[PDB]
Amino acid sequence: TSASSHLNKGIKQVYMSLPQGEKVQAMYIWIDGTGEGLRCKTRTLDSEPKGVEELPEWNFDGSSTFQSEGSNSDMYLVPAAMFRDPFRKDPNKLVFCEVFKYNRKPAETNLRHTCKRIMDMVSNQHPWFGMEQEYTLMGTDGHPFGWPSNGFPGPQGPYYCGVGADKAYGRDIVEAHYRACLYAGIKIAGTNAEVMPAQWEFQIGPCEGIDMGDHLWVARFILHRVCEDFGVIATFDPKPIPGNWNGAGCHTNFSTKAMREENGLKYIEESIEKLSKRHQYHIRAYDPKGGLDNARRLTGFHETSNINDFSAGVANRGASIRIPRTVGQEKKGYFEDRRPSANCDPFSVTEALIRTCLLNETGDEPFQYK
């Protein structure tokens, strides 16, 4: 539906296949003042950087990104992770950044800074995460892509992992995103068409520590750019359509070295225990509005837990935490936190998990350290 999507793409293609020369493009990516939106810009480099360390710091105007007031508005980008650019091909790069203010302090929405620290504190336990990112394809009118105009498709049931024109809306986006990620070097585990038509999932992982946040964010950025090409919107809102229509969540898989090795199930249950005593804290960390967004998703019905009550169970689709059936069988593996909203900050989610399960914190606020 978007106007730019109707421009002649063959023309872009023609320019895109000009041999580019020795110079190299770097697209810097970062997180908005909203804690949800991504921004980016591009600079030329003199040659292909061999790793993230070779990339210059950069800056931008924070008052144009909901990130500062008048006089001291300038803000700083510090390269954190680097990937191959699937939009421009090699030698070009995507550069995920951290955001700092003028006084070189982390920005309000720079959650990576603190999370990176917390992950270093527990590196010997080798924490691994996986995330199931759900999203919904929308036209520029805000109506789900490929839904009848001002209407509803038929009821849920045929669309989950569906195939065929009447079943799966917008697969091209999925397919393209998937390769884009592979090429970029993102740890994309797979994908499926979700329960609501025009709703899809991709899985990212397994990722060690800080890597989880980095990979999910960049995957998200790639999804936006791909959607942008096709002229549609990806929405990470946890409940895009009110009523009998699936919400979107961000299921998180977690395991330590302990949990993965034999009889790890013991440690799994131990951390589930600590979690049960910190439900309220985790909901606060599981979406950028402190739990207000997730409230519309976590209702009990439609295979969700209630936002108010903690619960756990082996192969329990309706619980706050699920231990996979076969994880229960072999008494080792990982568990799944089904609480995080589709629009959560993965840095916020992974940090909270470590704090509660591994550094045994309690109270209503994150302990500060050395």
Residue 203 binds Cl ion (CB under 5 A): no
Please state the closest distance from residue 274 (CB atom) to a second copy, in A. 26
> Rule CB under 5 A: which of 33-52 touch Cl ion?
41-42
Residues from 309 through 328 that contact a second copy (CB under 8 A): 315-318, 325-326
The CB-of-160 to Mg ion minimum distance in angstroms stands at 9
- CA pair distance 154, 19, nearest whole angstrom: 49
217 membership: H or E segment, kind and range = helix 211-230
Residue 17 token pair? 């296949």
Tell the burial category of 280 from Cβ atoms under 10 Å away from its Cβ (0-12, 13-18, 19+): exposed
Q: Binding site: what residues are annotated?
A: 132, 134, 194, 201-206, 244-245, 251, 253-255, 317, 322, 334-336, 338
Q: 346-357 vs 265-276: helix axis angle to the nearest 10?
A: 100
> How near is the Cβ of 365 to a second copy at its closest, in Å?
27
- Interface size with a second copy, residues (CB under 8 A): 115
| Ordered DSSP codes for 314-327 | ET-TTSSEEE-HHH
Distance between CA 236 and CA 249 in Å, rounded?
8
Residues 32-71 that bind a second copy (CB under 8 A): 37-44, 59-61, 63-66, 70-71
> What letters, b where the CB count within 10 A reaches 16 and e where it falls short, cover 134-149?
bbbbbbeeebbbbbee
Candidate list 122, 160, 208, 359; residue touching a second copy; CB under 8 A? 160
- Count of residues in contact with Mg ion, rule CB under 5 A: 1
Please select the residue that binds a second copy; options are 47, 117, 154, 360, rule is CB under 8 A. Answer: 154
Decide whether 201 or 293 has the Cβ nearer to Mg ion: 201
Tell me: does residue 266 bind Cl ion (CB under 5 A). Answer: no
- Binders of Mg ion in range 290-319 (CB under 5 A): none
Which tokens in the block code for residue 306? 């209630």
φ, ψ of residue 118 in degrees (nearest 5): -55, -35
Instruction: Return the DSSP state at 367.
Output: P
Annotated binding site for Mn(2+): 132, 134, 194, 201, 251, 336
Alpha-carbon distance values, 360 to 166, 274, 333, 353, 354 (Å)? 49, 7, 21, 10, 8
Q: Which residues pair with 144 in a beta bridge?
A: 138
- In the shown chain, the binding pattern of residues 264 to 303 toward a second copy, with x for contact by CB under 8 A and - for none, equals ---------------------------------------x
* Contacts of Mg ion in 185-204 (CB under 5 A): 201
Instruction: Give the closest residue to 174 by CA, choosing from 230, 248, 236.
Output: 230
* Nearest-approach distance from CB 118 to Cl ion, in angstroms: 32
Q: How far is the CB of 316 from a second copy (least distance, A)?
A: 8
Q: Please say which residue, 15 or 369, places its beta carbon nearer to a second copy.
A: 15
What residues from 250 to 269 belong to the interface with a second copy (CB under 8 A)?
Answer: none
Cα dihedral across residues 296, 302, 304, 308: positive or negative: positive
30 contact partners, CB below 8 Å, separation of at least 6: 38, 39, 40, 77, 96, 97, 98, 99
CB of 234 to Cl ion, least distance (A): 16
DSSP code of residue 341: B
> Least CB distance from residue 207 to Cl ion, whole Å?
21
The residue of the chain with the least Cβ separation from Cl ion equals 42
Among 67, 110, 191, 246, binds Cl ion (CB under 5 A): 191
Instruction: Please choose which of Mg ion, a second copy, Cl ion, none residue 148 contacts, taking the beta carbon within 5 to 8 angstroms, the exact cut-off set by kind.
Output: a second copy
- Point out which residues bind Mg ion (CB under 5 A): 201
- Point out which residues bind Cl ion (CB under 5 A): 41-42, 191
